[PDB]
Amino acid sequence: SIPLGVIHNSALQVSDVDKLVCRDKLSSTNQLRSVGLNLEGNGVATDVPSATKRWGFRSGVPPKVVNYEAGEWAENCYNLEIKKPDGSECLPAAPDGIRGFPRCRYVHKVSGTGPCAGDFAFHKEGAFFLYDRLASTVIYRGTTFAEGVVAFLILPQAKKDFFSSHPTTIRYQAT
């Protein structure tokens, strides 16, 4: 029951695949797109102290990953290298294929010795962590990520593609 959006004459409306009339014609498989939107645009605070308080550790839930094709510029992105007091690395190492968010104006790198208390780090408000083009539910060590959400669309058939219109870093401690 994943909602799917339909665009006609630059208006947006929700539609189950069953509700589609013949008017909202879907002719080719390249009309279907997935877009990942950073939630900085929804007014959230983006400083490191406020962002750290929205990530938490848990055990017993396996990670998951989903693909997204288009994205958005991020004004702030994060990079985490937290450690346990004994020197062990808390977060998992990045699996092959996950590189990092392609576009960030600023990248916050956080390193410290705050005690993690679980197997993985999740998002307490349900949002995803966005990498180059793979959205994940977990934080991976050393890889830049941007907080965001994913949406699915049926784009209009046109001679020009929908996605063709008008074509620093700081380090802080933690505990």
Partner 1 sequence: AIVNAQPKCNPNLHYWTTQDEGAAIGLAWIPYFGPAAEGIYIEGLMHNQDGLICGLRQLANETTQALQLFLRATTELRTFSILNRKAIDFLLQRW
Ligand X SMILES: *[C@@H]1O[C@H](CO)[C@@H](O[C@@H]2O[C@H](CO)[C@@H](O[C@@H]3O[C@H](CO)[C@@H](O)[C@H](O)[C@@H]3O)[C@H](O)[C@H]2NC(C)=O)[C@H](O)[C@H]1NC(C)=O
Residues engaged in binding ligand X (CB under 6 A): 39, 125-127, 149
How many chain residues are in contact with a copy of itself, going by CB under 8 A?
Answer: 3
Residue 44 vs residues 32, 75, 85, 169: alpha-carbon distances, Å: 29, 12, 31, 20
Interacting residues with partner 1 between 88 and 107 (CB under 8 A): 96-97, 99, 102-103
| H or E segment and range at residue 50 | helix 48-52
Which two three-digit tokens encode residue 4?
A: 């799917």
* CB closer to ligand X, 123 vs 141: 123
Q: Using an 8 Å Cβ cutoff, are 172 and 48 in contact?
A: yes
Provide the minimum distance between the beta carbon of 120 and a copy of itself in the complex, in angstroms, as a whole number. 13
99 binds a copy of itself (CB under 8 A): yes
Give me Rg for the CA atoms of the chain. 19
What are the backbone angles phi and psi of residue 84, rounded to the nearest 5°? -75, 160
What is the distance between the alpha carbons of residues 29 and 146, in angstroms, rounded to a whole number?
28
Provide the minimum distance between the beta carbon of 32 and ligand X in the complex, in angstroms, as a whole number. 22
Provide the minimum distance between the beta carbon of 109 and a copy of itself in the complex, in angstroms, as a whole number. 22
167 binds partner 1 (CB under 8 A): yes
Enumerate binding residues for a copy of itself (CB under 8 A). 62, 97, 99
